[PDB]
């Protein structure tokens, strides 16, 4: 099982993720990283995760308040996925 840091750039600055992978399965996402803003981005990547992870897939809808953030965390698994 293969172990991915990747980072991209956020509306509140970089995010720092690690990417846990299983042939195509994305195992985890950690959040390692970010400086977004309380309550509205912080809040769009645990969402983006969850979204992730349950769908498999890097396909997935913005949390609407929040797209810089939302778009970071799609951006940064897809590097990992592409591997």
Known sequence: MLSYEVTAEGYGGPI???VYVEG???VDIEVL???ETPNLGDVAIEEMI????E???????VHSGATVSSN???????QAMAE
């Open 16 to 18: 720092r993720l690690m």
């Open 24 to 26: 195509e399965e994305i």
């Open 33 to 35: 990283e970010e400086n």
């Open 50 to 53: 969850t979204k992730i992870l």
């Open 55 to 61: 769908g498999q897939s890097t396909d997935v809808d």
């Open 72 to 78: 970071a965390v799609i951006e940064a698994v897809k």
